[PDB]
């Protein structure tokens, strides 16, 4: 998913 990917980004 696109979101689970943005989340992975925030955690760095």
């Amino acid at each position: 998913a696109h979101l689970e990917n943005e989340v992975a980004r925030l955690k760095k």
Partner: antibody
Amino acid sequence: DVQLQQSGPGLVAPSQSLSITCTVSGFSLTDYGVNWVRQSPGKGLEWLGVIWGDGITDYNSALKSRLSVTKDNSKSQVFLKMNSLQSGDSARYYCVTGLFDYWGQGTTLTVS
Amino acid sequence: ADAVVTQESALTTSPGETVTLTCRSSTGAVTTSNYASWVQEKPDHLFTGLIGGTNNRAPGVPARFSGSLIGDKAALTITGAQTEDEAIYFCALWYSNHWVFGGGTKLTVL
């Protein structure tokens, strides 16, 4: 640090449209998505749309027919076009990151 | 059609105190799939993202800001407010193919 710079003529005049360009830095459009949002005076924020890394697009169900969001992955740009503008479209337009973490300086649009 | 996102209109606190801003969804309990996010609007329409995806701090964001889910709602908590933290707080939920913003909560730090 990532930065988002808004530009483009914007325009004005009713019946015509708005055109905004958002240049990003600090990350590639191939990996993550960019959102578009606007806020009209006294009123709250409203999501307009997002364009993901893989090119897929999601729009605000009630404005869908009047807007188009495209991007050039190589130039790190994202374009927003909204047509058939009306007084109610007057507002401040912002381009933002995937979870609204980073913001662009915004662009003011006065229609009519 | 789509859901309504509800936030308290106003909240007030004081330096060093703790406060909790909430976010309700008209479709039922808020969940991790709603990827709750929070942005702060300061005078001059200065926007900054605080929390993204329920409990992740947008890099550069002071650690006093935390987020989580409590009793069917999303929550942003400021542990030990400061005077600069006075602003309007917006919550945003995701519904499979779109975001919906709450009406915002004006926070006063006396």
